Amino acid sequence: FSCNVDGGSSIGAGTTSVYVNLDPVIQPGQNLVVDLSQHISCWNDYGGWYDTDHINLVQGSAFAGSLQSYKGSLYWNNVTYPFPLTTNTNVLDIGDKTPMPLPLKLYITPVGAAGGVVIKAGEVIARIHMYKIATLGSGNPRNFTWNIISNNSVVMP
């Protein structure tokens, strides 16, 4: 099982930065939508539904310390969960070698945010843990973390 970010080199485990554009201005009452399907794709390394991969997101995935007061939702594979995640998500099954963009969106509601710059460019905004286990043998389980990083400032007036 492998993934990539923005069409880059293959990743089999570990932590990877995922850079995203955010609305540069956020009004109170509004949320930020982060569509991670635009960045992260994964695939089965054999294809043909031979040793199918089973992927889910993991309890504990959260905003990153500075933004832990924030509220959110996490859409994954037909279900929208409260974020930070308090349980493991449903399983997505990956059997084709053709990359599948992850069906993954984060909705962010800044809470307790003070005026001016609320998110910095280069700031890790959320850490999403993803778990993989396949079908044959032990399943060769692997952990991924997606460190979601803003490409730009976000300001609130």
Ligand X SMILES: OC[C@H]1O[C@@H](Oc2cccc3cccnc23)[C@H](O)[C@@H](O)[C@H]1O
Within 13 Å and on the Cβ side, how many CA atoms surround 124? 15
What is the closest distance, in whole angstroms, from the C-beta atom of residue 106 to ligand X in the complex? 25
Q: SS3 letters for 61-123?
A: CEECHHHCCCEEEEEECCEEEEECCCCCCCCEEECCCCCEECCEEEEEECCCCCCEEEECCCC
Going by C-alpha positions, the residue among 93, 103, 87 that lies closest to residue 53 is 93
Cβ contact 105:37 at 8 Å:
yes
If the CB atoms of residues 129 and 142 are measured against ligand X, the closer one turns out to be 142
What is the closest distance, in whole angstroms, from the C-beta atom of residue 141 to ligand X in the complex? 8
If the CB atoms of residues 1 and 81 are measured against ligand X, the closer one turns out to be 1
Dist. CA 111–CA 114, nearest whole Å = 9
What is the closest distance, in whole angstroms, from the C-beta atom of residue 48 to ligand X in the complex? 10
If the CB atoms of residues 10 and 90 are measured against ligand X, the closer one turns out to be 10
Query: Which residues contact ligand X by CB under 6 A?
Result: 1-2, 12, 44-46, 51, 53, 134, 140
If the CB atoms of residues 2 and 150 are measured against ligand X, the closer one turns out to be 2
What is the closest distance, in whole angstroms, from the C-beta atom of residue 138 to ligand X in the complex? 8
